[PDB]
Amino acid sequence: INSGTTCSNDLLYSNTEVSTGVCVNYDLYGITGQGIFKEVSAAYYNNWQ
Amino acid sequence: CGSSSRSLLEDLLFNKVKLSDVGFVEAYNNCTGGSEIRDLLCVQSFNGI
Ligand SMILES: *[C@@H]1O[C@H](CO)[C@@H](O)[C@H](O)[C@H]1NC(C)=O
């Protein structure tokens, strides 16, 4: 009860609601900041980066 | 003729130099959207410098 390795709804929303083209605040993958999402096509990223 | 008159040796001097006092204005204008990937002067300008 109330202590352990099996967590229930303690994690936040984690929504798929990317707001493109506007200035927002973000924390994705660990990095906090204030900026912009903007869609583009590029392919030097890998499936682990 | 019009008051936008450099000279030819002034052109050779003033084409190898990226950040003169007109490149700064035309790069600071380019901070609304990034529009290629990013710039460094926009990261400076949004941080007070
Ligand atoms: C400003 O942006 C436009 C399009 O985004 C580009 O064609 C131009 O070369 C840029 N100028 C500078 C000085 O970055």
Swiss-Prot record, chain B:
Site-annotated residues for Cleavage: R6, S7
Region (Fusion peptide 2): 26-46
Disulfide bonds listed in the record: C31-C42
Glycosylation, residue list: N30
Region entry Fusion peptide 1, spans: 7-28
Domain of life assignment: Viruses
Task performed by this protein: Acts as a viral fusion peptide which is unmasked following S2 cleavage occurring upon virus endocytosis.
Protein name: Spike protein S2'
Organismal lineage: Viruses, Riboviria, Orthornavirae, Pisuviricota, Pisoniviricetes
